[PDB]
């Protein structure tokens, strides 16, 4: 999995 | 934001 | 799955 | 927003 | 399945 | 931020 | 399901 | 809100 | 399940 | 807020 | 799971 | 916050 967050 | 996942 | 949100 | 899911 | 929206 | 993971 | 609201 | 779910 | 809410 | 589970 | 919040 | 778990 890959998460791209503030 | 970016979720990539199963 | 991929998601692109705020 | 986009989704792409099965 | 593909989603596009707001 | 960023979480790469399984 | 998929639902989307206020 | 979004809700994805089964 | 995902859930996207406030 | 965002909960992604089973 | 994953849970983002305030 | 995040909360990744199981």
């Not at 999995?1 to 503030?6: A, C, E, L, R």
């Amino acid at each position: 999995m890959m998460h791209f967050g503030n």
